[PDB]
Amino acid sequence: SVLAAANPIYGRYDDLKSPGDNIDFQTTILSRFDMIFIVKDDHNEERDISIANHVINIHTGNANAMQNQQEENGSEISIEKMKRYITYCRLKCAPRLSPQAAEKLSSNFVTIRKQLLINELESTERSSIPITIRQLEAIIRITESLAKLELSPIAQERHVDEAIRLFQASTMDAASQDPSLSEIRRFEQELKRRLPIGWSTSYQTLRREFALDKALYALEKHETIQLRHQGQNIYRSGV
Amino acid sequence: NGLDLMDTNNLSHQEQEYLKEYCDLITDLKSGDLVDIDLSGSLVPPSDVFIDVRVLKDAGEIQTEYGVFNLIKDSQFFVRQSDVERLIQQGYLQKI
Amino acid sequence: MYYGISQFSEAYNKILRNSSSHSSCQLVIFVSCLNIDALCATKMLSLLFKKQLVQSQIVPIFGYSELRRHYSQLDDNINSLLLVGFGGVIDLEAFLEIDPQEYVIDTDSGEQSFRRDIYVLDAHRPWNLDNIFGSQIIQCFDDGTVDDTLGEQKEAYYKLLELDRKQRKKQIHEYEGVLEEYYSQGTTVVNSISAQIYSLLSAIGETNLSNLWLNILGTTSLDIAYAQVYNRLYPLLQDEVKRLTPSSRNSVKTPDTLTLNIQPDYYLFLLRHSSLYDSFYYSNYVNAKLSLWNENGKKRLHKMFARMGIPLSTAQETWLYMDHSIKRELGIIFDKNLDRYGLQDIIRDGFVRTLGYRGSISASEFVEALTALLEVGNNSAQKLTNLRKRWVSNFWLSWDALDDRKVELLNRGIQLAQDLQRAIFNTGVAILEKKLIKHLRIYRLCVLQDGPDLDLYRNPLTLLRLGNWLIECCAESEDKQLLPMVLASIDENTDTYLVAGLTPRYPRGLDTIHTKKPILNNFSMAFQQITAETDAKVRIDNFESSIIEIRREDLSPFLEKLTLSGLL
Amino acid sequence: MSLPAHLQQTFSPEEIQFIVENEPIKIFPRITTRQKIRNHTRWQLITTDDKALNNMVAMRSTEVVLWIALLLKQQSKCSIVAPQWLTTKELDRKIQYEKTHPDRFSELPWNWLVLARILFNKAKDDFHDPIHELRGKIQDLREIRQIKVLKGLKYLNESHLQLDNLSLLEINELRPFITEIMDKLREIHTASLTA
Amino acid sequence: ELLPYPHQLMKRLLNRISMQSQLIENISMGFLDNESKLPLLCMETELERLKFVIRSYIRCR
Amino acid sequence: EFKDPSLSLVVPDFLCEYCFFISDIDFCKAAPESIFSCVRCHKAFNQVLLQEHLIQKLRSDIESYLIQDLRCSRCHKVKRDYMSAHCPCAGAWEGTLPRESIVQKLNVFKQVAKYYGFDILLSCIADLT
Amino acid sequence: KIYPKLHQMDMDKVSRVYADLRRESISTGSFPITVRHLESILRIAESFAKMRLSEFVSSYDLDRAIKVVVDSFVDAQKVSVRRQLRRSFAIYTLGH
Amino acid sequence: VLPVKIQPPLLRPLAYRVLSRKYGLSIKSDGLSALAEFVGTNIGANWRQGPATIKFLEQFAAVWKQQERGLFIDQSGVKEVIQEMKEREKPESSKALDWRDYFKVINASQQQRFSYNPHKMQFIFVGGIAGFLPDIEDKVQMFLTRYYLTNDRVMRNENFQNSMSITPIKNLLGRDAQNFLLLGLLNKNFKGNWSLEDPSGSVEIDISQTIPTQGHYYVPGCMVLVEGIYYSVGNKFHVTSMTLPPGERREITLETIGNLDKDLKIRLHLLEKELTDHKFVILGANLFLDDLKIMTALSKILQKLNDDPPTLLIWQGSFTSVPVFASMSSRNISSSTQFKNNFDALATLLSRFDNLTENTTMIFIPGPNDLWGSMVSLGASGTLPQDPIPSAFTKKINKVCKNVVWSSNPTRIAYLSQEIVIFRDDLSGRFKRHRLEFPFQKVQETRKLVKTILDQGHLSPFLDSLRPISWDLDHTLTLCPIPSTMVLCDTTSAQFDLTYNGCKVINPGSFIHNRRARYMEYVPSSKKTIQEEIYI
Ligand SMILES: [Zn+2]
Ligand SMILES: [Zn+2]
Secondary structure: OOOOOOOOOOOOOOOOOOHHHHOOOOHHHHHHOOOOOOOOOOOOHHHHHHHHHHHHHHHOOHHHHHHHHHHHHOOOOOHHHHHHHHHHHHHHOOOEEOHHHHHHHHHHHHHHHHHHHHHHHHHOOOOOOOOOHHHHHHHHHHHHHHHHHOOOOEEOHHHHHHHHHHHHHHHHHHHOOOOOHHHHHHHHHHHHHHOOOOOEEEHHHHHHHOOOOHHHHHHHHOOOOEEOOOOOEEEOOOO | OOOOOOOHHHOOHHHHHHHHHHHHHHHHHHHHOOOOOOOOOOOOOOOOOEEEEEEOOOOEEEEOOOOEEEEOOOOEEEEEOOOOHHHHHHOOEOOO | OOEOOOOHHHHHHHHHHHHOOOOOOOEEEEEEOOOHHHHHHHHHHHHHHHHOOOOEEEEEEOEHHHHHHHHHHOOOOOOEEEEEOOOOOOOHHHHOOOOHHHOEOOOOOOOOOEOOOEEEEOOEOOOOHHHHOOOOOEEEEOOOOHHHHOHHHHHHHHHHHHHOOHHHHHHHHHHHHHHHHHOOOOEOEOOOHHHHHHHHHHHHOOOOHHHHHHHHHHHHOOOOOOHHHHHHHHHHHHHHHHHHOOOOOOOOOOOOOEEEEEEEOOOOOOOOOOOHHHHHHOOHHHHHHHOOOOHHHHHHHHHHHHHHOOOHHHHOOOOOOOOHHHHOOHHHHHHHOOOOOOOHHHOOEEEEEEEOOOOEEEHHHHHHHHHHHHHHOOOOOOHHHHHHHHHHHHHHHHHHHOOHHHHHHHHHHHHHHHHHHHHHHHHHHHHHHHOOOEOOOOOEEEEEOOOOOHHHHHOHHHHHHHHHHHHHHHHOOOOOOOOOEEEEEOEOOOOEEEEEEOOOOOOOOOOOHHHHOOOOEOHHHHHHHHHHOOOOOOEOOEOOOOOEEEEOOOHHHHHHHHHHOOOO | OOOOHHHOOOOOHHHHHHHHOOOEEEEOOOOOOOOOOOOOOOOOOOOOOOHHHHOOOOOOOEEEEHHHHHHHHHOOOOOEOOOHHHOHHHHHHHHHHHHHOOOOOOOOOOOHHHHHHHHHHHOOOOOOOOHHHHHHHHHHHHHHHHHHHHOOOOOOOOOOOOOOOOOHHHHHHHHHHHHHHHHHHHHHHHHHOOO | OOOOOOHHHHHHHHHHHHHHHHHHHHHHHHHOOOOOOHHHHHHHHHHHHHHHHHHHHHHHO | OOOOOOOOOEEEEEEOOOOOOEEEEEOOOOOHHHOOEOOOOOOEOOHHHHHHHHHHHHHHHHHHHHOOOEEEOOOOOEOOOOOOOOEOOOEOEEEOOOHHHHHHHHHHHHHHHHHHOOHHHHHHHHHHO | OOOOEOOOOOHHHHHHHHHHHHHHHHOOOOOOOOHHHHHHHHHHHHHHHHHOOOOEOOHHHHHHHHHHHHHHHHHOOOHHHHHHHHHHHHHHOOOO | OOOOOOOHHHHHHHHHHHHHHHHOOOOOHHHHHHHHHHHHHHOOOOOOOHHHHHHHHHHHHHHHOOOOOOOOOHHHHHHHHHHHHHHHHOOOOOOOOOHHHOOOEEOOOOOOOOOEEOOOEEOOOOOOOOOOOOOHHHHHHHHHHHHHHHHHHHHHHHHHHOOOOOOOHHHHOOOOOOEEEEEEEEEEOOOOOEEEEEOOEEEEEEOOOOOOOOOOOOOOOOEEEEEEEEEOOOOEEEEEEEEOOOOOOHHHHHHHHOOOOHHHHHHHHHHHHHOOOOOEEEOOEOOOOOOHHHHHHHHHHHHHHHHOOOOEEEEOOOOOOOOOOOOOOOOOOOHHHHHHHHHHHHHHHHHOOOOOOOOOEEEEOOOOOOOOOHHHHOOOOOOOOOOOOOHHHOHHHHHHOOOEEEOOOOEEEOOOOOOEEEEEOOHHHHHHHHOOOOOOOHHHHHHHHHHHHHHHOEOOOOOOOOOOOOOOOOOOOEOOOOOOEEEEEOOOOOOEEEEEOOEEEEEOOEOEOOOEEOOEEEEOOOOEEEEOOOEO
């Protein structure tokens, strides 16, 4: 198994640039990897305080006590024990999918490929992160590993649901990164002038007015509108 | 029968009824004629009459045949193995 | 006196008559955990009652609150109670709410009998006169102090008891002064409970090698803080070892022979279970005599090892695998090259027990292993109870360590002892480098506010271990005059401190007239007096009287009032 | 079912010890229950003879059932006398017999292993010979008898087998193998002889 | 095979257990008012052994 | 660090029945004389009206908690479907009004009722549990 | 021969400094402020403690490291925002 | 029968001898003392209590099934059960069985949490001031649990009756033109077109050219059984015929849940025959106490009932003419205290009848214009599991009577082995308003309403945006057992009494229809209803 750590060009991700510009790896090499994690520096104050307080505890000797206490509490496993457990699981269990699990995996692979197709059609450019049959086998392998760690001879739908969640959190997240313009500007101007600052309009009405309408999501980023009633109501948040 | 009467959702309705009546049948056997001997007792031979035990789970106070046992947690007794067999099997006393 | 030395057999026979019934378990032994001497005494009692098939219950109690709660929970059928390691310094009938009229049966005929007998068994000398003299339910296993050194107190107590003009009032105040001067005295220890129970066994005739070994362990538990007591009791153990060892000496070793021996047992730290270098380095006495805490101490140690001609590679080798040439010349080498550094007191005679082919072990090492197992074996008023629960649980680990079939637990205890001594050394060098000990004209305070592994010191035994380290270091410094020391350790989870008022002691091996008079720990009365007024959420429940748990915010005013308190 | 799987057709070694503990042994009492000519509770047991128990005289050898001798030896109230076969001279004689006749076992008592273990554990100080040598000879006898068994389990036919002089614990530990291999070699034979 | 049941022997054994349990209870009541407890302990443990033998026999059957 | 010792509990747009003054009455912060009487005038206010408005705000808070819209905890996209284990971006759903906020509001209401002796408000709080 | 330890310290001050550094790095800045720049404060404090041959990092040795790190961050910013950044960070270098 | 006091020490030997040796029950000191007290009180000289202890332990092992019998609750419970079994056999008691011990009313806040484990299990789930606040996962699973219950109902009825399978919506993706049978929750997408929501996903449906079963109300939020051909050209499901899931008989659900003991069933069956003459009177809806005419009519009704008081007198919701809300005024408008005055006036017209208000449980059901529910909704259909009328407004009414219960709007009655559910809501109006049209008399509409409610299996098969529901208190609305008797109170539907799938549905209607104070009478023993119109 290959666990490879890389770095996008320019060091930082630079989400202003296209997702294909940050990653210099070819599609062929990127297709082998089952899960392609793209982590980012959130620069969130509440998370930064937590990270700082954790790192300081690491430095000021507090780790040698806290980790030992957690391990003896039973919420952790020492390296010498996890290594033996991993060897035992690998030499004892090789789970195979149940038919209900296989139906879920197929119906999810179709959804994933449809989403990739619509993203490619919208962007009119092949996605840098590929989704192929090798990724269906990747989800199969993740499901079987999740079942294996429990020594379950057959992989239920719980493992399929968790494997699907893991794939969505890693490779779909990597592939979903996004950077016409005249239509976006027209939509923003017309809804700013028509829909007042303090009121709300329903989305079916905006559809009648008319697309994918990513302009509404962009405005939601700018905190000028807000979809509240389960997406059925578009409310001008006050900007 | 000397440990606990229990997840029961693993059993079908027929199996649950079978177990429920089977416990009653066992109790009937333990009361018909073989009441002097404890038919549900342990099948290990009674090697030593006197044993020492350690209280695992606190159970306050439990009345024995003559005196009483104060099952204080992490307190060690030295009593006859006869009158603590059920508690040991249930999971309140540990040693031997 | 209540029960002298010569009449322990009377107490044992009374216990047998009252509660040796196979029908039920009418005997309950209350043992104070965090006390090796009480642990060995209770092991002796357990073995003795196992021989006579007397059903009994052994309860480890940590504090006085637990004792009161258990006694309240105690059933009325139990007609024999043993308190091991505590109860001799407090008004037990008052503390437990005991009135003799509700426990008396068959009053008639100059005799009295009671439905429950409490036998207190401890070594702390401030005997409560209402226990040793004015109560029949409470029966104290005296060691001969009361019948010889409490005549004046006996007369003073009895005169006031019987008497309920000017001469009468003056004499009452004179007698009451005798009682008062008896109190306001620090709590010391004169004897070992293990030796007392071994004396009882000698009276009954149940002595054997295992009981003698438990006696040796209990006595050696006193050598760190009460070396005068250990030196007093050592000749008796030396005689007993000679008496019990079989005449078939110089025989071949067989997988069954158990040998108690009196051989040179140097006063190092786990010498046989660790390297020679680590035995010197982590020894309390060597640290005091060389000041290894500073940087120059390690250089002094290396220079000493070079002087003896022991290579550092050989010195750091594990004691089992040390070359037989060096290991067989330790006595000669130590004779030649120890008086130079002032470590002549390192050479000593101790007891070493070998069980067949399992290798030697000395009582000094065994008690360190037992202590380690007691210490680290496994919103605010609840987590503390969890700590008490774990502390009670560790008592059974230390108890099972005594059995010869659980050597795999004694080895774990040895490893824990080495780790704890390492942690104690690290915290000691951290305290002595930052100069945390604030010198005063009353008591040298020292508060642990922050650092590593500070959760080790919420245990009273580990805090006393660190305090003994510091006190040994200070005792060998001539400039530093003798003065009580205070240690505190903040518990972050409970936001409470653990103040442990200690006592100073003279340098080990220094025998003088003032050394003969023991030093008395006056912190108990000071703590109780300060807590009685000025409510500060102080928890005075430890059998070790000079240890309290105080709130984080209330610590400083408490220490201020203690400074204003001239009791100690 | 009522009887666990590991107790189906064999005896657990605890049950073998239980069976052995019912055999009489000779003891030297440390008490005296013999009522004088000039109260007291008598044993009056129901599964053995109480006559030798109500008439114990200190240091006068009697014979009591083993599980009672052990009960008294729990205190210091008796002293179990080792059987004559449990001495170094007799053990050496039996070892010589085993080394001299490689086709048949020696005539050791059926409970020799169980009795040796029980006496070594509970009566370790009642042997006229050093126990560190009795253990070393018991182990030697066990090793020789194990060598002879492994070379006779090479004769597991389908008709019968004569394990003469074999002990009880050895038979008990060999039962699930011998009695389940001979069953299969018998089923094969009867299947062949279906004509 | 299931061996034939010894009705008479088991009837006598159960009668003996009942009578001995009653005797032990009566002696205990008398003691509930020398201090020789070895005979009583031996009675109790002997009865326990007999009960175990009958227990195992019945459960095997 | 300094944290404000007082919380806030405002009855928005309270109306004075005499001078027609529209003010936001705050109960946890304002002085007692500034809540039982108006500001521009000095006429008193009904205890029943204050308790009624406090109860109305409490029920409004409860209803707003119950009818809130869930949203993903990672991409913050509002939940649109009715049966969904988690967001399609592998993020657990979370409410726009956290439960702890409503718990704090309820504790504030209980404290105000116990201090000012609002009987009907205490009855409401008891009726909740 | 020296290895200072960070026992006595105010982790709150270092955490606040790191949070402020990241907040001002993301907006109106280009110097990357990762967790490495949080550990740089501790390493520089340990070096300063080494200079005094001390075996424990004092509060001065931590304030000096914080000042060094924030100064190196600020002086690399554009002159337009340098005054504002210095004013914002002045509250951590109080005393010098 | 001779009283005596016996101390625990002497009873201890025999007690243990039986409880512990025979069956394996550990007796504590306090429990031993309580058992000694019981034996001393109900027998003298404490000799022949062996059968009593044997009965105690056998009942304990048959029902309670645990250890440590000395808990003061297990002993009391087993003694009581012995008392009732001795009573039905016809000591401590030898009287007749009373239905009061078997009659209870369950509020919406005191039912058993029953969440269905999706594969096959109906699990049981069972803390401060804000301990009633539902968690977020409760809102997440509120519709999932309902879907699982409906899916189990379909898997039990449809396949064994009709045998097309149910394909989850996620399975329709790659298939191009195949025929599928979907069970999904009908709803409107944010894009404005109808769709079905399933735990596996959702799909838009082309409702044109659909032939629906005319005997049902179809509204958004109701779970339907559509059938059609999927098309991948636009990802739409061209539905052809859509119908509500088939209902289930109650007895069928009971063996699946398996909830009753045999003795309790026998006693309940016995009192079913013994208690033949019990009458339940269900008053009309909208008892507007503010109205003087309704107040006078209620006086005549109460006078008529005073001659022969019934077992239960159920009062329906909206006790006041106008919704209660915070009113800014200096008069006695005071919508809170005016409610108190109305209930005090009711106390005057209700305490006047001594024969009534005695031996008659008086259950009150809130409505759309009641306190604590109309504060925010202003008389609209707000949160459905309405909390009972606050006790602060029931001082005089509760003081006048001795057995008055203030219960939730969807309350449950446990009078006998049968269950009775009372629900006050204008279901017909909402159903008619939100019924969706298909592009493709009065009794028929009532049958449609009852069939829709029972086939859905939910009291309110509506979306969360149309009838907000407390997330944890949703099982109080689910008709998983399909109770035998349901009081589907209404104000916009004609009075009716219909039976369907073993369930009796009765709607008393408005209190005043034209000029008569209508009310309903129910006889549980005969399962027969009759209306009693009284002229003003
Ligand atoms: Zn005003
Ligand atoms: Zn999301």
